[PDB]
Ligand binder design. Structure first.
Ligand code: CLA
Ligand code: CLA
Ligand code: CLA
Ligand code: CLA
Ligand code: CLA
Ligand code: CLA
Ligand code: CLA
Ligand code: CLA
Ligand code: CLA
Ligand SMILES: CC1=C(/C=C/C(C)=C/C=C/C(C)=C/C=C/C=C(C)/C=C/C=C(C)/C=C/C2=C(C)CCCC2(C)C)C(C)(C)CCC1
Ligand code: SF4
Lengths: 41, 32, 80, 164, 64, 105, 731, 107
């Protein structure tokens, strides 16, 4: 599956994994920390 | 008082009809 | 008529003549390249200016060069 | 009150708008059974709403005549009056991540230029090299100023121009 | 002797109207005759016409 | 149709352009008077509809007759004087046709 | 065969683009056949006489139609509850409800309500009767005829000027500062002091008694004595009724600031002192230069000595006088840049500081004048860069411009275009991001989560000018500062009582919607200059086309090769900038119109809550204020806004027709026109009728110009119908 | 007649739970407009168990289609003169697809 891992390392597959990662990071943040308009403490 | 009933058909129906004619005849003239 | 000039960066690979849809271009003997030949534009009265010649020139900053000039009934490509 | 403004914990249009939103949620809630699944989500929306108003009034945001929080985007009026978390703290919390990505991509380009053919590792990204540059790019402003002090950040007039 | 750069040396283009101006390619052959543009340079950078090679003169050519 | 086109005046070479313009004028006059007299701006008046529908039709014939002489000075029957005779015959024939449309009301 | 008398190559064109290019490169005198530089300058001089005569004929026509079909004498008596009249309507296509709908303003026939502001400008300069306006129309018709005689006679060979006369830049810049600007402003102060001031006080000063009526009761003795303060002793009171002598006042050169309390306009006394002061300063600046008398300064010596060393500007300004004087496109570019900026200045300062009596009560006049001069300024500012792009192709010489600022500009052109690209990309990213953010917050019912950045930097400027609404108390809103204290008798208290009035346009109070829209304006300005500067600097060449200067300014392309070269010329980069220019001026006039509509209605909070998000721009300004516009005609009837209801659709029709020339390009249409040529040449009895010009489709550059022309005309006509109807319907 | 058809529910994160409107029937979601509920009444569904089982059947049939394309390209792919039997394709598609399919829907 070395060719399958080179397919997993192509541009749109990395794009759709990394954008789901950076989407579902910010989404879990806005679940556990609702409505951040201002930098609080 | 008769000026808008006379100058407006001349300027829009008569003098452009000269301009649709005399400025068109000048286009296709054969150069000597 | 259009202005079709060529330049001494010609490598003589005669691709502008094959690309020409109007037989404006032709290959002339010359001694500035390995192919011993350079193009020419003897028939620029028939040129339309469609620039297929300089889609086919391989030399960087094209050796053939069409300059769009006055338009006759042959430069406009009219059957009428 | 910096520029004709007022604290949101002081203004009454802010509290009136809170009561307006809770009134819309209440008249929306009045249709359902008290323990059903829509009513739980509506009361959770009310709880998030009231927590949002409490934490906007707590941080000292400035309301206007409209009853809406404002952002003072000037240091020296944010640092002096305690509004640095509005713009002045996230204007570096952004730029760390911006220069982070701009440094990681820069180093991924420069570390792939000197290969057999670079373009194949730009459509097919070398993932161990990418994750190595992802982790070790954490100190990017440090490495950026150490690269600027060389002159290895810029390139000289070896660059490509037209006809100056 | 063999005028021009050698068979595979890196080179820099000084033709200002070229696509590869101030840009580095490999000489692949230098024609040893009275040709105006003897130095043949191949690039990795292709131009807008998709061509990676071009002829250049001797004054439009400088090593490294 | 090669037989039918040998009848209408624009193809009859052996007849004068004056009579050609006259027959074209009277054959277009009561035609073009129709849309002005049946459905123009002043239709629902049984005094002025047949008057305005003829006066505007005669004005449109005058426009077409000036426009023919404009074409004749542009292009040069196929002569500078034959098309002028055609234009004058069309003016007389088209105004006669509009008047004939006002007759047969 | 004959019609391009200037172009023998266009004269040999058998097609129908002979006509279209005979109309279009007729005033490109440099590309004419047989043109020399002397005949160039002579035709430009005659052309400038023709433009001056048309401007004077146009103004005389305005005066004559106001004097004849207008109610100026009736408007003088009541300038608040009487609408002005432009000209009467004679439209035979009208029906009886249309005749009865356009009769207003106290007239008898159908009339048009003028929004050009000319009654307010003429009433404050002394016009009171129609007989004062017929004399003005006859005078400007005579002056227009004089300029037509002048443009005819300076083409005659006994009166044709030399080549060297036009290149006297020294004498021209002397005379057009001293005489054309200083003496003209001094004469306008002479009109203000002698005529406009006593007519504002209610005393008739015409051509019969101006040698017998003193402007000041002790006149010309304080000027010769030295006590000029005697010309400012008794100004007009705060109970002054304009045009009468009820609490009149006797000063002629006062210095007050603020507004007249009745007319809400600038005082005529300090407008007189304004034009007198800048007349004196223009005369002093116009005796600066050395023409033919030994003293002064020379243009050949000042330029090539301002060069900073150590690689600051390179060789500095060395070699510009060889290129400013020899190039006309450089002079036209600088002239258009200056005129297009001071036209924006006229627009910005005629709404906030209205100079004319009973202006800024006529709201439709104010909206029309602002939007008018802002689009005039946008077109003139994009043409400044257009002729700056024509300069680099036709006029620029690198061997004449070795190392100056004009060559260093082309040297780092990539840095200029890349930094304009960065600024435009930043401004668009974050302006659209904050607007879409506020729209998503308004949609989810949470207005409190909006990014509402307060405009701190401009509220600080308002508070430094004396607006005590924000509490920054810096210079003029602080009662203890020195700039406050050292002007309390000179010019400050009227200005402070005029800013702190919340019902004029003098430094409007501003909030986060004005932050967002000033950054939208900055986006538009930086992107329009990105397109224009990129067209001016790549006008000579690029890596896609290193010999773009060999093809000229306007050309279609360089074909499909090298990837494709659509819109590669500098003309085609002016072209794409006109769209972003109309965008920018549309943003500034949307913002002006909506902030003033909410000001005039009273509810500035209705703007402040809605201008923060683009749905509020769509439904509270475009949807809301276009009700009485689109109800100009309906199946129930029609009213006086129906001519703006029609034009609003008419502008919608031209605009879309522009897209036909914009989206569809030539070659579809040539293939369609060839089938039409077949159908005409095979139709029986239509074979007799044959063309003289062979029908071809419109050329590529022509398709650009026609689509841009329809785009701009539909844009202007739509917004003019919307602006005039939206303001004058409810007001 | 008084309950709006809804078949899409959003997750309550960034305030988008306002899109879960009061469609009726003790339910919050997005009011659909694709007409599936009227299909399902016209088919006689009457239970979400039948919808769940025909959804499982649709997943099974989607796997059958993906396996079929894999099979008829990679494992046993038809020759050219198989495709050029357009008479057999029309007889089978008028008969089996259109005819037997509407006979089965008649059943
Ligand atoms: C440029 C314009 C712009 C700006 C400045 C903002 C700004 C904001 N928006 Mg907005 N928005 C915009 C455009 C913009 N938006 C557009 C165009 C839309 C429409 C798509 C929206 C739609 C939108 C919604 C629907 C919401 C916002 C929200 C917000 C707030 C952000 C809260 C948040 O998520 O905290 C994020 C805070 C962080 C600290 C994230 C940093 C990430 C981590 C912590 C740092 C890294 C740590 C670690 C190293 C990572 C591990 C790496 C891993 C590999 C192991 C903030 C006020 C939210 C809000 O509360 O409104 C006020 C909200 O609900 N916006
Ligand atoms: C666009 C530039 C700009 C402008 C117009 C202002 C405007 C102002 N600043 Mg300011 N400021 C700026 C940039 C700017 N600032 C920057 C970049 C910094 C450094 C981070 C500061 C730091 C600063 C301080 C420290 C102070 C101001 C103050 C002021 C006010 C006087 C005025 C509102 C002063 C203030 O509070 O008003 C009296 C003050 O004390 N500013
Ligand atoms: C401000 C108005 C103005 C002025 C002063 C001139 C002035 C002139 N035109 Mg011009 N022109 C104008 C508007 C104007 N034109 C307009 C609106 C058009 C139609 C697009 C033309 C079309 C036009 C043509 C076609 C020609 C001129 C020509 C001329 C010159 C004789 C003279 C310099 C002639 C010229 O330059 O030949 C020497 C000529 O052939 N003009
Ligand atoms: C003192 C002598 C004098 C004077 C008065 C003039 C006057 C003029 N010359 Mg001239 N000239 C002179 C000497 C003089 N010349 C000499 C000695 C030479 C030879 C070196 C020339 C060579 C020359 C050329 C080659 C040309 C002129 C042109 C012009 C005209 C300028 C057109 C225009 O509108 O600008 C005047 C502009 C304004 C009045 C408006 C701007 C003023 C301010 C800054 C704007 C804001 C205030 C505004 C007025 C408020 C408006 C309110 C209301 C009126 C709407 C004008 C008639 C040009 C022309 O049109 O040809 C006839 C032209 O092409 N001249
Ligand atoms: C170019 C402009 C101009 C012109 C042609 C005149 C012309 C005249 N002025 Mg005048 N004036 C002007 C500008 C001008 N003034 C300005 C700018 C001011 C303000 C300082 C005045 C203030 C002024 C006063 C106060 C008086 C005149 C007077 C006069 C008249 C006789 C002059 C001896 C004469 C009609 C005198 C006169 O006879 O009044 C009619 C007189 O008393 N003028
Ligand atoms: C002082 C003002 C001034 C002057 C003297 C010039 C002078 C010149 N310009 Mg320039 N220009 C100016 C302002 C000026 N421009 C401005 C403000 C712009 C921005 C709009 C431009 C944009 C511009 C471009 C892009 C080009 C020129 C060109 C030219 C040259 C040829 C003129 C020409 O083609 O005429 C003939 C002009 C026309 C026939 C105009 C076409 C008609 C327009 C589109 C108006 C249509 C509106 C329509 C009538 C509205 C009716 C509505 C309907 C419903 C009733 C000449 C040197 C050209 C040049 O040098 O060629 C290389 C060129 O390419 N200029
Ligand atoms: C609404 C129409 C519209 C919009 C949005 C733009 C936008 C832009 N134009 Mg313009 N333009 C337009 C119409 C428009 N134009 C028209 C009609 C013309 C005449 C042909 C031009 C001619 C023109 C020229 C000639 C130039 C521009 C330039 C620009 C850029 C300016 C920089 C900027 O603001 O970046 C901000 C970016 C935006 C506002 C758009 C980005 C939208 C979001 C943020 C992207 C991400 C959304 C989302 C995640 C994507 C999901 C997609 C998919 C997965 C579903 C920008 C891309 C200039 C340029 O390139 O500058 C560098 C330039 O030179 N334009
Ligand atoms: C895991 C199983 C598997 C494997 C390893 C292969 C392997 C191969 N197949 Mg094969 N194939 C398979 C299953 C498989 N196939 C199935 C299930 C089908 C039926 C659909 C086919 C149909 C098929 C055909 C018809 C062809 C191949 C070809 C190929 C070769 C190159 C394919 C390529 O470049 O992939 C990269 C391609 C993809 C990853 C395709 C992705 C597109 C998928 C199928 C649909 C997209 C769905 C998505 C929802 C749409 C996006 C919208 C989005 C915004 C929501 C290679 C030998 C080609 C060949 O031999 O060329 C000579 C060829 O022509 N295969
Ligand atoms: C009675 C037999 C029969 C039936 C029912 C079908 C049905 C179909 N054929 Mg078809 N075909 C047949 C015989 C048949 N064919 C023959 C004999 C030939 C050779 C001449 C072809 C050659 C052919 C080609 C070349 C193509 C089709 C395609 C299609 C599909 C059209 C899309 C559609 O309407 O989806 C309707 C969807 C359904 C009815 C869903 C039910 C799915 C059933 C179970 C599969 C179809 C029945 C199948 C033929 C039975 C074989 C079972 C298998 C184990 C052997 C459809 C599934 C096209 C297609 O989409 O290919 C995938 C296509 O490109 N056919
Ligand atoms: C393309 C080109 C061109 C054109 C250009 C242009 C178009 C430009 C523009 C320019 C511009 C358009 C500029 C502007 C400027 C402006 C400015 C420079 C301003 C200033 C101002 C100031 C300085 C102010 C000050 C002040 C303040 C702050 C406030 C208070 C008062 C005072 C005064 C103090 C040419 C032709 C040359 C050619 C080359 C290139
Ligand atoms: S131009 Fe290109 S193609 Fe034409 S001759 Fe020279 S080299 Fe051969």
């Amino acid at each position: 599956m070395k060719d399958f891992t080179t397919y997993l390392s192509t541009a749109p597959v990395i794009a759709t994994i990394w954008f789901t990662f950076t989407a579902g990071l910010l989404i879990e943040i806005n679940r556990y920390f609702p409505d951040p308009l201002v930098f609080s403490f | 008082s008769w000026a808008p009933s006379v100058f407006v058909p001349l300027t829009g129906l008569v003098l452009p009809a000269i301009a649709m004619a005399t400025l068109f005849v000048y286009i296709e003239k054969e150069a000597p | 008529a259009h202005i079709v000039k060529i330049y001494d960066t010609c490598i003589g690979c005669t691709q502008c003549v094959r690309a020409c849809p109007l037989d404006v271009l032709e290959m002339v003997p010359w001694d500035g390249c390995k192919a011993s030949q350079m193009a020419s534009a003897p028939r620029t009265e028939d040129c339309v200016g469609c620039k297929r010649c300089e889609t086919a020139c391989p030399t960087d900053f094209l050796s053939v060069r069409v300059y769009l000039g006055s338009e006759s009934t042959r430069s406009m490509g009219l059957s009428y | 009150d910096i520029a004709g403004l007022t604290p949101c914990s002081e203004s009454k249009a802010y509290a009136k708008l809170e009561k307006k939103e809770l009134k819309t949620l209440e008249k929306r809630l009045k249709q359902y059974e008290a323990d059903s699944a829509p009513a739980v989500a509506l009361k959770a929306t009310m709880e998030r709403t009231k927590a949002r108003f409490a934490n906007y009034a707590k941080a000292g945001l400035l309301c206007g005549n409209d009853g809406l929080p404002h952002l003072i985007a000037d240091p020296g009026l944010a640092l002096k009056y305690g509004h640095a978390g509005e713009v002045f703290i996230p204007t570096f919390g952004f730029l760390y991540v911006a220069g982070y990505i701009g440094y990681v991509g820069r180093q991924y380009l420069i570390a792939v230029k000197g290969e057999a053919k670079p373009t194949d590792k730009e459509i097919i990204i070398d993932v161990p090299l990418a994750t190595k540059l992802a982790w070790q790019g954490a100190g990017w402003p440090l490495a950026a100023v150490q690269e600027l002090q060389r002159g290895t950040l810029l390139e000289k007039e070896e660059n490509i121009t037209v006809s100056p | 002797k063999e005028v021009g750069p050698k068979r595979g040396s890196l080179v820099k283009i000084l033709r200002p109207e070229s696509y590869w101006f101030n840009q580095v390619g490999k000489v692949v052959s230098v024609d040893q005759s009275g040709v105006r543009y003897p130095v043949v340079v191949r690039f990795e950078n292709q131009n807008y016409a998709g061509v990676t090679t071009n002829n250049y003169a001797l004054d439009e050519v400088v090593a490294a | 149709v090669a037989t039918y086109l040998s009848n209408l005046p624009a193809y009859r070479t052996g007849v004068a352009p004056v009579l050609r313009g006259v027959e074209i004028g009277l054959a277009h006059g009561f035609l073009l008077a129709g849309p002005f007299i049946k459905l123009g701006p002043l239709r629902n008046v049984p005094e002025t509809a047949e008057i305005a529908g003829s006066l505007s039709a005669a004005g449109l014939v005058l426009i077409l007759a000036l426009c023919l002489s404009i074409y004749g000075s542009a292009q040069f029957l196929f002569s500078a004087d034959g098309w002028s005779e055609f234009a004058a015959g069309f003016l007389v024939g088209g105004e006669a046709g509009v008047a004939w449309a006002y007759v047969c009301t | 065969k004959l019609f391009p008398k200037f172009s023998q190559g266009l004269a040999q064109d058998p097609t129908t683009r002979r006509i279209w290019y005979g109309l279009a490169m007729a005033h490109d005198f440099e590309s004419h056949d047989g043109m020399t530089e002397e005949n160039l300058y002579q035709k430009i001089f005659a052309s400038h006489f023709g433009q001056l005569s048309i401007i004077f004929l146009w103004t005389s026509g305005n005066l004559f139609h106001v004097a004849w079909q207008g109610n100026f004498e009736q408007w003088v008596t009541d300038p608040v509850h009487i609408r002005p009249i432009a000209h009467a309507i004679w439209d035979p296509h009208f029906g009886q409800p249309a005749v009865e709908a356009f009769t207003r303003g106290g007239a008898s026939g159908p009339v048009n309500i003028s929004t050009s502001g000319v009654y307010q400008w003429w009433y404050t300069i002394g016009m009171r009767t129609n007989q004062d306006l017929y004399v003005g129309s006859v005078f400007l018709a005579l002056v227009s005829a004089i300029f037509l005689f002048a443009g005819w006679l300076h083409l005659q060979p006994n009166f044709q000027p030399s080549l060297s006369w036009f290149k006297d830049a020294e004498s021209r810049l002397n005379h057009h500062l001293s005489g054309l600007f200083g003496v003209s402003s001094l004469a306008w102060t002479g009109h203000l002091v002698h005529v406009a001031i006593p007519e504002s006080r209610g005393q008739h000063v015409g051509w019969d008694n101006f040698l017998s009526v003193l402007p000041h009761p002790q006149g010309l003795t304080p000027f010769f004595t030295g006590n000029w303060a005697a010309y400012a002793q008794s100004p007009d009171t705060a109970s002054h009724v304009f045009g009468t002598a009820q609490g009149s006042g006797q000063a002629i050169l006062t210095f007050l600031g603020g507004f007249h309390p009745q007319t809400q306009s600038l005082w005529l006394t300090d407008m007189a002192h304004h034009h007198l002061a800048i007349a004196v300063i223009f005369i002093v600046a116009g005796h600066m230069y050395r023409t033919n008398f030994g003293i002064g300064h020379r243009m050949q010596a000042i330029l090539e000595a301002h060069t900073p060393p150590s690689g600051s500007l390179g060789a500095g300004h060395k070699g510009l006088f060889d290129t400013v004087n020899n190039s006309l496109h450089f002079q036209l570019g600088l002239a258009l840049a200056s005129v297009g900026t001071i036209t924006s200045l006229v627009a910005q300062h005629m709404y906030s500081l209205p100079p004319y009596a009973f202006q800024a009560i006529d709201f439709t006049t104010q909206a029309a004048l602002y939007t008018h001069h802002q689009y005039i300024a946008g077109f003139i500012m994009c043409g400044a860069f257009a002729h700056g792009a024509i300069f680099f192709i036709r006029d620029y010489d690198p061997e004449q411009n070795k190392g100056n600022v004009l060559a260093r500009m082309l040297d780092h052109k990539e840095a200029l275009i890349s930094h304009l690209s960065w600024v435009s990309l930043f401004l668009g990213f974050h302006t659209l991001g904050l607007y879409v953010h506020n729209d998503v917050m308004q949609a989810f019912g949470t207005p409190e989560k909006q990014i509402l950045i307060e405009p701190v930097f401009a509220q600080w400027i308002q508070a430094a000018h004396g607006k005590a609404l924000y509490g920054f108390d810096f210079l003029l809103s602080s009662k203890t500062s020195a700039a406050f204290a050292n002007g309390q008798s000179l010019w400050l208290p009227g200005w402070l009582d005029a800013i702190n009035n919340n019902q004029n346009s003098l430094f409007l109070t501003i909030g986060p919607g004005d932050f967002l829209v000033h950054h939208a304006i900055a986006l538009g300005l930086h992107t329009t200059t990105l397109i224009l500067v990129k067209g001016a600097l790549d006008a000579r060449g690029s890596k896609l086309m290193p010999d773009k200067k060999d093809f000229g300014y306007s050309f279609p392309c360089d074909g499909p090769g090298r990837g494709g070269t659509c819109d590669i010329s500098a003309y085609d980069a002016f072209y794409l900038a006109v769209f972003w220019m109309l965008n920018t001026i549309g943003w500034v006039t949307f913002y002006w119109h909506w902030k003033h509509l909410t000001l005039w209605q009273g509810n500035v909070a209705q703007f402040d809550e809605s201008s923060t998000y683009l749905m509020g721009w769509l439904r509270d300004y475009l949807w809301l204020n276009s009700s009485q516009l689109i109800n100009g005609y309906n199946p129930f009837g029609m009213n006086s806004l129906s001519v703006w209801a029609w034009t609003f659709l008419f502008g919608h029709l031209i605009y879309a027709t522009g897209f036909m020339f914009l989206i569809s390009w030539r070659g579809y249409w040539q293939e369609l026109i060839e089938t039409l040529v077949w159908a005409h040449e095979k139709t029986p009895l239509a074979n007799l009728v044959y063309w003289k010009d062979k029908p071809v489709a419109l050329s590529i550059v022509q398709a650009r110009l026609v689509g841009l022309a329809h785009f701009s005309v539909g844009y202007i006509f739509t917004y003019a119908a919307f602006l005039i109807a939206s303001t004058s319907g409810r007001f | 007649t008084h309950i709006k058809p809804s078949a899409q529910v959003v997750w309550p994160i960034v305030g988008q739970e306002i899109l879960n409107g009061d469609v009726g029937g003790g339910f919050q979601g997005i009011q659909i407009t694709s007409g599936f509920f009227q299909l399902w009444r016209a088919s006689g569904i009457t239970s979400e168990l039948q919808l769940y089982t025909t959804a499982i059947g649709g997943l099974v049939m989607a796997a059958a289609m993906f396996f079929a394309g894999w099979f008829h390209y990679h494992k046993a792919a038809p020759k050219l003169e198989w495709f050029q039997n357009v008479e057999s394709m029309l007889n089978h598609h008028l008969g089996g697809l259109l005819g037997l399919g509407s006979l089965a829907w008649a059943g």
